[PDB]
Amino acid sequence: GHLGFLPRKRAASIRARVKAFPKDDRSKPVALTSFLGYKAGMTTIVRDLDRPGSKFHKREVVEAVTVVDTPPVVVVGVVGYVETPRGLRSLTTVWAEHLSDEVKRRFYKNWYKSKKKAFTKYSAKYAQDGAGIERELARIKKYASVVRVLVHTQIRKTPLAQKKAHLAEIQLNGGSISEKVDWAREHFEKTVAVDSVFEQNEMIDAIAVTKGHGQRGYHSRTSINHKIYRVGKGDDEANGATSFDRTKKTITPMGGFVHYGEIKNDFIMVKGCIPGNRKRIVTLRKSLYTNTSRKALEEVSLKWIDTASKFGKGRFQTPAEKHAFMGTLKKDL
Amino acid sequence: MATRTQFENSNEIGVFSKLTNTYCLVAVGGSENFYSAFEAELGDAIPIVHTTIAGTRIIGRMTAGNRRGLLVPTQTTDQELQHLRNSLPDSVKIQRVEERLSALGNVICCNDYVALVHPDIDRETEELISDVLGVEVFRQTISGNILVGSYCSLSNQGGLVHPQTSVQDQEELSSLLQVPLVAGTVNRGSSVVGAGMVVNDYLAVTGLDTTAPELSVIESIFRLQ
Amino acid sequence: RISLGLPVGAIMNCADNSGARNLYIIAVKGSGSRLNRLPAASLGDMVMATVKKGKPELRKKVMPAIVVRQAKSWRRRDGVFLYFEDNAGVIANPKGEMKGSAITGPVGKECADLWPRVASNSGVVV
Amino acid sequence: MRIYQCHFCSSPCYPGHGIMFVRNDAKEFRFCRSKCHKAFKQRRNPRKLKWTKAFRKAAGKELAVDSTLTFAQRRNVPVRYNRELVATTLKAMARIEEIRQKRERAFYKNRMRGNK
RNA sequence: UACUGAUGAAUGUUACCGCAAUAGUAAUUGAACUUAGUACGAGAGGAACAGUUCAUUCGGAUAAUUGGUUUUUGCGGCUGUCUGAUCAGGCAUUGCCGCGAAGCUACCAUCCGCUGGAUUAUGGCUGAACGCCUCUAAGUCAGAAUCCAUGCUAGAACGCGGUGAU
RNA sequence: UGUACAACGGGGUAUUGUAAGCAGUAGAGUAGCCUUGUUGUUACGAUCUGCUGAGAUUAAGCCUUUGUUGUCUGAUUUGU
């Protein structure tokens, strides 16, 4: 087979780490480079294709897409990395004082017996006008070429019972390192939204650990160039409603996804299929560069979203459609 | 007046376009030169419509119509039908026909006054053609070729059929149409003359392989100058 | 792209009024080169075929053939999947000009879009 | 887009679902799922089998002729599109859905009577 | 004993986040649309750059459909064998048949499969040797699917850092 | 020792193809008889209806759960 994917062996964790990051544009202000979420289901989309010079120009096209459940991810720290003759080197990490129960759970393999003594004397180290905290922020403000942000998942918002927040690193491609640490200063403990990283019609790339079977499977894979079709919002009702369809419905199928619950928060609808399976954590990066082709150019018009019960079969979209067709039954009246 | 152009480097113009006295239909491909050919000849006098039928470029040999009406097959989508009505004034009517067959361009070889159809067609279509288009319907064939829209190019000035037509069929069918008929070729010796070129009373657009002897025949019978 | 249903060594019937009854597929034009697998044809694909049952004029002659009926579940970009009743193909020259004047039975939408003269010589499409 | 009725069920067939068959006689045979298609292969009368709507329209389990059911005609004549002429249809379809369900509920009570 | 892989004591303990010395590496070929029936040519014929759309094989993923599937040994039907007879199937080296989720798992399916430097061959520029000339000796510009990085895979079990816990 | 966990109960969900039995007056015929029954009887009737899109698997690798019940601490080792 493929000689490049060797050794074809098992990954270190469920949360795979991103080996590279996008380059830099110093002229821009501070922006995140990647965002994390959980893979959940495979839905059907039909839409009119506004692709010029095509065999399917202005025609309706069917294609299967995936909906990654993405909760608002919250910052709990920031890191500085110096440039060395031996690569990079973390000189200092610094944290946000008031951490959730979820991140505190990550630092223990046995949460139940533990006395929950996580960031106690470190929070006592904060307890003043800075002096030690502001010193280490100044340390990163002096040296360290690349500045990475420590974030975690709001797992309680997620319908999964895993209850253990995944820590990841996301660098910043907004130049002048002083602004990087000052952005992170303003954004300690703060919850970062999904639409405040990606928009619709953007080519992106996802990282994941691939569906294990028996050694075969359970590798970390990175597939590139995937178009985000819909950046949804949980507080916004009628997510399944397009500009065309406009029927008040959630993107979630009747009785949740296959092996996954309801979507009571933000979501990303990625073209095709992301690696890994449902209940698996993914991290969406932003393409590394300007990927300008006509595959990237077109701004899509989503016509209709399939929300039929994938569990078995589906002839209906909403529960309203079931009783509209069936009429009334015995247990009803 | 007799124009000579192409679509996606193909000689069969009547496949990918249908032209009347009041309108012209064109496919939506990558090339805009085919649309620019009719835009040069007709201009802003009569509307030229960018559209498809059942999501296909093959538009000319799938439809039927004249100055009074327009007829499309069962396979036509609702959005195409929506845009077609949005494009065309009240002088022209539009109606979808629920049918067995879909090739209306291969069946209905019509103008403003006389329509020639397939003998195997249902009665309801014949009842609807005469009402909407304001024409006379005739279940007639030419020289043992069952498709008549494919093998006949037709307008109010003159008519053109494939060269395999007998003299008996020429004189008899011309008496029905009230206009003279010539059995000639289009696009360097091809039988399919309806699909080979589009025609009306003031324009005759052909494919690029239509020779000067073929052009002289077309100019003579359809009487351009 | 559409799914493949007509293998090498298959008897597809004749749909036009040329004279032949059936066509035996001997070779596929515009094919892939897989290991331990013969090429497979789909709707609208040109394939070399010999006349098994037909007139002496049409027979004893190897010639190309454009497929009009696939009968194996293919894909439309408009959602729904479809397949015809029987495996069948028509014969034409390298230019695409039909020997027959009229074609009986359904001719596929993919074949009709690809070949202009096939769409011209069609009686009933879909 | 178009929401079709099944040849077997007369149920709403959505894009990306079911199988359409085309006969040599050339008319559409759209299905909702492979089960109904396999029943059609076995040459079964759709009206005979009870779980479809073909039985219910014939036997009279659910009403066949109604003023709400005539409104869902396969419309032929195309319209010029006015903004308010579509804005009215949004509220209209929502209203006629209520009347269709209520008159079916009235038919249900005319069917369930005889138990007492 | 190489080789695929898997544990493992030890360098305050334990835990969490990482850095990357090194080593491996990956995509391949064709067709079509516009450029066109334009340059070009008596004609016959007939390009390409730029802009796009697919497919081949290879490789990496993946089960939503398809498919050999199966010991839900899921339910219907039939049988060898009976229980005092309907019931209950008690049983049949895995009894037969109809169909089936979960799984085993496949070009039998679907998705994905990258940009910066430095060069060879060569084409140059400035310009000696050798009062002319010369791509070269001292410089310098462009340039091959090459090379080396970017990206990707693994992380030195004696390579290293930051941070939580007394 | 708390939207903590497990076992059930419920719901959603698909699979099979119409459960045994009961109500039967329907059921060509009839084993045998009559006081040959627009109530035939005593066993049946190749079957059809109401229960019957039911019975049953309904996670042993489904999901949800305002219900119920049972649980929540043994041993060892480490910190120049």
CSV table of N, CA and C in Angstrom, one decimal, chain B residues 76-129:
chain,number,residue,atom,x,y,z
B,76,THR,N,-39.8,18.5,-17.1
B,76,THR,CA,-39.5,19.9,-16.8
B,76,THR,C,-39.7,20.1,-15.3
B,77,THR,N,-38.7,20.7,-14.7
B,77,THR,CA,-38.7,21.1,-13.3
B,77,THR,C,-39.5,22.4,-13.1
B,78,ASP,N,-40.0,22.6,-11.9
B,78,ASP,CA,-40.8,23.8,-11.5
B,78,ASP,C,-40.1,25.1,-11.6
B,79,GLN,N,-38.8,25.2,-11.3
B,79,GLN,CA,-38.0,26.4,-11.3
B,79,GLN,C,-37.7,26.9,-12.7
B,80,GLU,N,-37.5,26.0,-13.6
B,80,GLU,CA,-37.3,26.2,-15.0
B,80,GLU,C,-38.5,26.8,-15.6
B,81,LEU,N,-39.7,26.2,-15.3
B,81,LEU,CA,-41.0,26.7,-15.7
B,81,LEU,C,-41.4,28.1,-15.1
B,82,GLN,N,-40.9,28.3,-13.9
B,82,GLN,CA,-41.0,29.6,-13.2
B,82,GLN,C,-40.3,30.7,-13.9
B,83,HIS,N,-39.0,30.4,-14.2
B,83,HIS,CA,-38.1,31.4,-14.9
B,83,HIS,C,-38.6,31.7,-16.3
B,84,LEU,N,-39.1,30.6,-17.0
B,84,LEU,CA,-39.7,30.8,-18.4
B,84,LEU,C,-40.9,31.7,-18.5
B,85,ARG,N,-41.8,31.7,-17.4
B,85,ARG,CA,-42.9,32.6,-17.3
B,85,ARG,C,-42.5,34.0,-17.0
B,86,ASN,N,-41.4,34.1,-16.1
B,86,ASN,CA,-40.8,35.4,-15.7
B,86,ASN,C,-40.1,36.1,-16.9
B,87,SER,N,-39.7,35.3,-17.9
B,87,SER,CA,-39.0,35.8,-19.1
B,87,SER,C,-39.8,36.3,-20.2
B,88,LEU,N,-41.0,35.7,-20.4
B,88,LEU,CA,-41.8,35.9,-21.6
B,88,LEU,C,-43.2,36.6,-21.4
B,89,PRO,N,-43.5,37.6,-22.3
B,89,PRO,CA,-44.7,38.4,-22.2
B,89,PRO,C,-46.0,37.7,-22.4
B,90,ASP,N,-47.1,38.4,-22.2
B,90,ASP,CA,-48.5,37.8,-22.3
B,90,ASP,C,-48.9,37.4,-23.7
B,91,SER,N,-48.2,37.8,-24.7
B,91,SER,CA,-48.4,37.4,-26.1
B,91,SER,C,-48.2,35.9,-26.3
B,92,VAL,N,-47.3,35.3,-25.5
B,92,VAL,CA,-46.9,33.9,-25.5
B,92,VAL,C,-47.4,33.2,-24.3
B,93,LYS,N,-48.1,32.1,-24.5
B,93,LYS,CA,-48.6,31.2,-23.4
B,93,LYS,C,-47.6,30.1,-23.1
B,94,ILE,N,-47.5,29.5,-21.9
B,94,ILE,CA,-46.7,28.4,-21.6
B,94,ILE,C,-47.5,27.3,-20.8
B,95,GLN,N,-47.3,26.1,-21.3
B,95,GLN,CA,-48.0,24.9,-20.7
B,95,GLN,C,-47.1,23.6,-20.7
B,96,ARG,N,-47.0,23.0,-19.5
B,96,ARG,CA,-46.4,21.7,-19.4
B,96,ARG,C,-47.4,20.7,-19.8
B,97,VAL,N,-46.9,19.6,-20.5
B,97,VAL,CA,-47.8,18.5,-21.0
B,97,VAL,C,-47.4,17.2,-20.4
B,98,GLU,N,-48.3,16.6,-19.6
B,98,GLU,CA,-48.1,15.3,-19.0
B,98,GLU,C,-48.3,14.2,-20.0
B,99,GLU,N,-47.1,13.6,-20.4
B,99,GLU,CA,-47.0,12.7,-21.6
B,99,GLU,C,-46.3,11.4,-21.3
B,100,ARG,N,-46.3,10.5,-22.3
B,100,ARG,CA,-45.5,9.3,-22.3
B,100,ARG,C,-44.1,9.7,-22.9
B,101,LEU,N,-44.1,10.3,-24.0
B,101,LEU,CA,-42.8,10.7,-24.6
B,101,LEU,C,-42.4,12.1,-24.2
B,102,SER,N,-41.1,12.4,-24.3
B,102,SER,CA,-40.5,13.7,-23.8
B,102,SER,C,-39.9,14.5,-25.0
B,103,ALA,N,-39.6,13.9,-26.1
B,103,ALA,CA,-38.9,14.5,-27.2
B,103,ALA,C,-40.0,15.3,-28.1
B,104,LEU,N,-40.3,16.5,-27.6
B,104,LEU,CA,-41.3,17.3,-28.3
B,104,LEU,C,-40.8,18.0,-29.6
B,105,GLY,N,-39.4,18.3,-29.6
B,105,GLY,CA,-38.7,18.8,-30.7
B,105,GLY,C,-38.6,17.8,-31.9
B,106,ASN,N,-38.6,16.5,-31.5
B,106,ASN,CA,-38.6,15.4,-32.5
B,106,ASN,C,-40.0,15.0,-33.0
B,107,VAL,N,-41.0,15.6,-32.3
B,107,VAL,CA,-42.4,15.2,-32.7
B,107,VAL,C,-43.2,16.4,-33.3
B,108,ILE,N,-43.2,17.6,-32.6
B,108,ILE,CA,-44.0,18.7,-33.1
B,108,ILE,C,-43.1,19.6,-34.0
B,109,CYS,N,-43.3,19.5,-35.3
B,109,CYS,CA,-42.6,20.4,-36.2
B,109,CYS,C,-43.6,21.5,-36.7
B,110,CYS,N,-43.7,22.5,-35.9
B,110,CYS,CA,-44.7,23.6,-36.1
B,110,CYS,C,-44.2,25.0,-36.4
B,111,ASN,N,-45.2,25.8,-36.9
B,111,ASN,CA,-45.0,27.2,-37.0
B,111,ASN,C,-46.2,28.0,-36.4
B,112,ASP,N,-46.4,29.2,-36.9
B,112,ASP,CA,-47.5,30.1,-36.4
B,112,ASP,C,-48.9,29.6,-36.8
B,113,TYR,N,-49.0,28.7,-37.8
B,113,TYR,CA,-50.2,28.3,-38.4
B,113,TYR,C,-50.5,26.8,-38.6
B,114,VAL,N,-49.5,26.0,-38.9
B,114,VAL,CA,-49.7,24.6,-39.2
B,114,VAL,C,-48.7,23.7,-38.4
B,115,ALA,N,-49.2,22.7,-37.7
B,115,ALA,CA,-48.4,21.8,-36.9
B,115,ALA,C,-48.4,20.4,-37.4
B,116,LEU,N,-47.2,19.8,-37.5
B,116,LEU,CA,-47.1,18.4,-37.9
B,116,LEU,C,-46.6,17.5,-36.7
B,117,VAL,N,-47.4,16.5,-36.4
B,117,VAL,CA,-47.1,15.7,-35.2
B,117,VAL,C,-46.9,14.2,-35.5
B,118,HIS,N,-46.6,13.4,-34.4
B,118,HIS,CA,-46.4,12.0,-34.5
B,118,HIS,C,-47.8,11.3,-34.5
B,119,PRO,N,-48.0,10.2,-35.3
B,119,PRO,CA,-49.3,9.5,-35.4
B,119,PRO,C,-49.6,8.7,-34.1
B,120,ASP,N,-48.6,8.3,-33.3
B,120,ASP,CA,-48.8,7.5,-32.1
B,120,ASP,C,-49.2,8.2,-30.9
B,121,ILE,N,-49.2,9.6,-31.0
B,121,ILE,CA,-49.5,10.5,-29.8
B,121,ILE,C,-50.9,10.3,-29.3
B,122,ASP,N,-51.1,10.6,-28.0
B,122,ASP,CA,-52.5,10.7,-27.4
B,122,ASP,C,-53.3,11.8,-27.9
B,123,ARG,N,-54.7,11.7,-27.8
B,123,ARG,CA,-55.6,12.6,-28.3
B,123,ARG,C,-55.6,14.0,-27.6
B,124,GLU,N,-55.3,13.9,-26.3
B,124,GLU,CA,-55.3,15.1,-25.4
B,124,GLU,C,-54.2,16.2,-25.8
B,125,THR,N,-53.1,15.7,-26.3
B,125,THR,CA,-52.0,16.6,-26.8
B,125,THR,C,-52.4,17.3,-28.0
B,126,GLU,N,-53.1,16.6,-29.0
B,126,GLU,CA,-53.6,17.1,-30.2
B,126,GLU,C,-54.7,18.2,-29.9
B,127,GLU,N,-55.5,17.9,-28.8
B,127,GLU,CA,-56.5,18.8,-28.3
B,127,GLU,C,-56.0,20.1,-27.7
B,128,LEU,N,-54.7,20.0,-27.2
B,128,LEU,CA,-54.1,21.1,-26.5
B,128,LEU,C,-53.2,22.0,-27.4
B,129,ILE,N,-52.6,21.4,-28.5
B,129,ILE,CA,-51.8,22.0,-29.5
B,129,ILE,C,-52.6,23.1,-30.2
